[PDB]
Amino acid sequence: AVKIRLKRMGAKKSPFYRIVVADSRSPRDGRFIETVGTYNPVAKPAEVKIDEELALKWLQTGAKPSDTVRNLFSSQGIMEKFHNAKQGK
Amino acid sequence: ARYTGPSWKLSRRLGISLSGTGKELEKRPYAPGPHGPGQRKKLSEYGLQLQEKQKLRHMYGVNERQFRTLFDKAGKLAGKHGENFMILLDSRLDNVVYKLGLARTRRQARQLVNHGHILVDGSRVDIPSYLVKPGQTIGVREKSRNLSIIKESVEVNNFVPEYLTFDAEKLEGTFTRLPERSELAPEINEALIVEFYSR
Amino acid sequence: NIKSAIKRTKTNNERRVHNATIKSAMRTAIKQVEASVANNEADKAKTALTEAAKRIDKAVKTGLVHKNTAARYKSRLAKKVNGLSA
RNA sequence: GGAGAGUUUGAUCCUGGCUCAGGACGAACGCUGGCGGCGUGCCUAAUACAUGCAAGUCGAGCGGACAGAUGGGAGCUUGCUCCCUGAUGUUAGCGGCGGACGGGUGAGUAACACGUGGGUAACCUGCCUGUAAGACUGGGAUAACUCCGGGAAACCGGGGCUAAUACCGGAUGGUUGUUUGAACCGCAUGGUUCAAACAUAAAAGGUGGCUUCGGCUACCACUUACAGAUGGACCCGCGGCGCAUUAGCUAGUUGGUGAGGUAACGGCUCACCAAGGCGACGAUGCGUAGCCGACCUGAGAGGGUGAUCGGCCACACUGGGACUGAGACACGGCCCAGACUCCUACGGGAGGCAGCAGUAGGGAAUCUUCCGCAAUGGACGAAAGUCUGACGGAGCAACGCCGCGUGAGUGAUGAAGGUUUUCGGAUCGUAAAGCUCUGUUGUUAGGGAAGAACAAGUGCCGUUCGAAUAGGGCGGUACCUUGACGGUACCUAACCAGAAAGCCACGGCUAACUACGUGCCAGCAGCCGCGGUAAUACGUAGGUGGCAAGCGUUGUCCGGAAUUAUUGGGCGUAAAGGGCUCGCAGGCGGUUUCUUAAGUCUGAUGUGAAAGCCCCCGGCUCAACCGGGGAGGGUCAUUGGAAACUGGGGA
Structure with missing residues (x-):
């Protein structure tokens, strides 16, 4: 399905993801479903703020993260709190 | 790389003797050159154009690329045209350096500012065109502050700017606001920069 | 010079054979x-309708049918078989 | 937020072209050439290709097969082999998924191809969510495996044997089709929902763990029905191009009925019938061309291009074709034909660099046959992992943009030399010498392995499942490692001014002047035009001026160009009134009054993706650049108002 994963952007010295929700198998720097987030790797270090008000609709509406998307959205209190959305199961 | 001119005839035929404020060729007030002792004549609109652009640009000394980008970049601001270009083209890191009583020469204070020495804002500022806004502590880079040039310029006096603020003992500095835009009253008339660089 | 899935070529041959057997x-x-x-x-009409029905759904329910074309074929055949017998 | 100047004349003004100043490139060439950061680099021949890598994976689906800890018995060597069992590891084949995404190129195509905006009671959707039912009973195969064979190879054939998550019967299931009874609502077609008869599947899988050894259970699976999501398919309004020295075109064409077909309406294809249909609002035909977000330029309207990043379409040696599949008519899949190359035992085989490099050609013109899965995205997985020429990086090229430098202070001794000079002198000139300072980059030596690093695995907790305190899912907390670039960036110390400046111009436009030589010769030149012995124009030398690690020439595009003029031109004599009339179509129209919203104008929602332009901040020492926050962009749809004006209608 739509795997909400990262996407490169920035200069050639330092890449910073801005992980918008994307299709099943789109191009890397290409089409994405509905962009929500931005999280650079460096600076300083790893400071990124995500949506969580529509991103809960994205992670609950049929999706999944990548590795870095899962650690990031599990770090910002959105994967666990979404799990408390599923805790009313 | 601007640091190439003679520094006598450039002011000598550039239009006005600055800076200065006595190094204007007071021994021979005419223009420099082999056919220069004779009678000079006025130019066309390109005469005041080249005297305004070369005159106002020779006070700092930058290349025409960076000075042109300061022309349009200065015109991107608010206010008036020549005032924004005048506060921009003199509020640089080296004009703020040699204007704070740092060095007794514009090129000498320039190389004192991009020689790694005059590090400002608490850190280093190693680019001679990498300025600082109103409020940055334009420091002295105290790891080599015990020097001959800095101590001698701290002994030599000069009318410090009221847009800036100096420090001879505490090893600090500042710029209180934008400088006195019409107040900084040299012979550089900004209308020739509004005409000889606008087409 | 096919790198991978030459065995996909042979599987396309054998799968094409078995699929041609079921579809044909x-x-x-x-x-x-x-x-x-x-x-x-009459009696061959209903039992043969059961034959083309059972083979029809057994063909369209796996592989090359698939759904709407099978409903078109069984629908028109149901119209003719319902016509000739009431 | 917008600058003009030269050039027709003996002089003048109009009109009128022609050129120059400005910006820009995917540039190239001429001269020269220190560095760093960020982007860019076959645009000509979609020309042909040597060589290497570009799509594999699943032992936790399958039946092998080999090795083999450990154990067994023999012979001798007091350490070895021979024959068995076996943790274990590996893979050839079967099967499932993935090769349709990713990557590249603009060859095609002037229309549903693109952009925008609707629609689909005309479509389909594997993988992924969430729901809820199910997973019962059986069958016979077959590659492997061998035994023979025919082949130069490529390779085929035939006989025996086996299994699965391979295939194939039956039950069960509606919902999936056919008939009836309804009920509700629409857009002609009709749609939504309820009931009753005929047909349509399941991996009993695998993994563990438990158990009484009957079976139990979790996880990853299989099917069926639903909705969700992501994708594509179709139809339609409107928009974007040179030509009338293209006015005809069309016969599956225009329309009907009927049948077939595909996921689906449809002449989509056929039978039968009718004679239609398109066109000045440009049909057809020639030409050219991928289109768009956008980029460049302009004050703005406009004009030009479709590089690099992205979105869609197309193509894959040329031309057809269909199979596998959910999905291709498939870029490194097949079948046929054509071309071109290679092999040949002459019987027949093999190939597709418009993937990354790379070679030859073409040309003015474009580079390394490099490193790695550390990140991000994929693929396959239970995961560990494997593949990943995508990517992340690197190497070259001043190819573009930006930043810094090649010194600085002082210094009249106004040094020597060069140029000039009425021969007193002037100019390079505070310039140089010199006294003193700085280290940017250099050069050396250390630091630093800076960020780019998050995962996955190991406990434990809450909670789910579970006959279960096993075992697992789900969600948190803590431990261990993982850097290709890279000894990179950057920092620190020392050292030396030591290595780091050229190109064009100097009548005008246009900043910048004199001498020697040349003597309509050699030459320049963008235009004006110079040069026929005093050349501010040809070369040379000093000096000046512009610019700067760059500078000029040329190619193309914009502006200047009010020189296509809607903004914003004109026609008595400069170019320009049709010789004149009548008239269809078209374009425009007296005053009052009621309605209307079709234009006109305004409010609300949708949508105009990102990146880019502009505004507001932040991060790389600043800047180029990056990131965040905004804005603006439409005869756009749907919808609410005003009725003044154009129009519709009535008086």
């Missing part, structure tokens, strides 16, 4: 129940 069996059965609907035969 479906077409020949559909002409068989259609032939039984050619003449005014």
Whole structure:
């Protein structure tokens, strides 16, 4: 399905993801479903703020993260709190 | 790389003797050159154009690329045209350096500012065109502050700017606001920069 | 010089053979129940409708049918078989 | 937020072209050439290709097969082999998924191809969510495996044997089709929902763990029905191009009925019938061309291009074709034909660099046959992992943009030399010498392995499942490692001014002047035009001026160009009134009054993706650049108002 994963952007010295929700198998720097987030790797270090008000609709509406998307959205209190959305199961 | 001119005839035929404020060729007030002792004549609109652009640009000394980008970049601001270009083209890191009583020469204070020495804002500022806004502590880079040039310029006096603020003992500095835009009253008339660089 | 899935080529041959057997069996059965609907035969009409029905769903329910074309074929064959027998 | 100047004349003004100043490139060439950061680099021949890598994976689906800890018995060597069992590891084949995404190129195509905006009671959707039912009973195969064979190879054939998550019967299932009874609502077609008869599947899988050894259970699976999501398919309004020295075109064409077909309406294809249909609002035909977000330029309207990043379409040696599949008519899949190359035992085989490099050609013109899965995205997985020429990086090229430098202070001794000079002198000139300072980059030596690093695995907790305190899912907390670039960036110390400046111009436009030589010769030149012995124009030398690690020439595009003029031109004599009339179509129209919203104008929602332009901040020492926050962009749809004006209608 739509795997909400990262996407490169920035200069050639330092890449910073801005992980918008994307299709099943789109191009890397290409089409994405509905962009929500931005999280650079460096600076300083790893400071990124995500949506969580529509991103809960994205992670609950049929999706999944990548590795870095899962650690990031599990770090910002959105994967666990979404799990408390599923805790009313 | 601007640091190439003679520094006598450039002011000598550039239009006005600055800076200065006595190094204007007071021994021979005419223009420099082999056919220069004779009678000079006025130019066309390109005469005041080249005297305004070369005159106002020779006070700092930058290349025409960076000075042109300061022309349009200065015109991107608010206010008036020549005032924004005048506060921009003199509020640089080296004009703020040699204007704070740092060095007794514009090129000498320039190389004192991009020689790694005059590090400002608490850190280093190693680019001679990498300025600082109103409020940055334009420091002295105290790891080599015990020097001959800095101590001698701290002994030599000069009318410090009221847009800036100096420090001879505490090893600090500042710029209180934008400088006195019409107040900084040299012979550089900004209308020739509004005409000889606008087409 | 096919790097990978040359064995996909051989699997396309063998799968094409088995799939041609099931699909061509479906077409020949559909002409068989259609032939039984050619003449005014009652008991062969209903039982042969069960034959082209069971082979029809057994063909469209796996592989090359798939759903809407099978409903078109069984629908028109149901219209003719319902016509010749009431 | 917008600058003009030269050039027709003996002089003048109009009109009128022609050129120059400005910006820009995917540039190239001429001269020269220190560095760093960020982007860019076959645009000509979609020309042909040597060589290497570009799509594999699943032992936790399968039946092998080999090795083999450990154990067994023999012979001798007091350490070895021979024959068995076996943790274990590996893979050839079967099967499932993935090769349709990713990557590249603009060859095609002037229309549903693109952009925008609707629609689909005309479509389909594997993988992924969430729901809820199910997973019962059986069958016979077959590659492997061998035994023979025919082949130069490529390779085929035939006989025996086996299994699965391979295939194939039956039950069960509606919902998936056919007939009836309804009920509700629409857009002609009709749609939504309820009931009753005929047909349509399941991996009993695998993994563990438990158990009474009957079976139990979790996880990853299989099917069926639903909705969700992501994708594509179709139809339609409107928009974007040179030509009338293209006015005809069309016969599956225009329309009907009927049948077939595909996921689906449809002449989509056929039978039968009718004679239609398109066109000045440009049909057809020639030409050219991928289109768009956008980029460049302009004050703005406009004009030009479709590089690099992205979105869609197309193509894959040329031309057809269909199979596998959910999905291709498939870029490194097949079948046929054509071309071109290679092999040949002459019987027949093999190939597709418009993937990354790379070679030859073409040309003015474009580079390394490099490193790695550390990140991000994929693929396959239970995961560990494997593949990943995508990517992340690197190497070259001043190819573009930006930043810094090649010194600085002082210094009249106004040094020597060069140029000039009425021969007193002037100019390079505070310039140089010199006294003193700085280290940017250099050069050396250390630091630093800076960020780019998050995962996955190991406990434990809450909670789910579970006959279960096993075992697992789900969600948190803590431990261990993982950097290709890279000894990179950057920092620190020392050292030396030591290595780091050229190109064009100097009548005008246009900043910048004199001498020697040349003597309509050699030459320049963008235009004006110079040069026929005093050349501010040809070369040379000093000096000046512009610019700067760059500078000029040329190619193309914009502006200047009010020189296509809607903004914003004109026609008595400069170019320009049709010789004149009548008229269809078209374009425009007296005053009052009621309605209307079709234009006109305004409010609300949708949508105009990102990146880019502009505004507001932040991060790389600043800047180029990056990131965040905004804005603006439409005869756009749907919808609410005003009725003044154009129109519709009535008086």
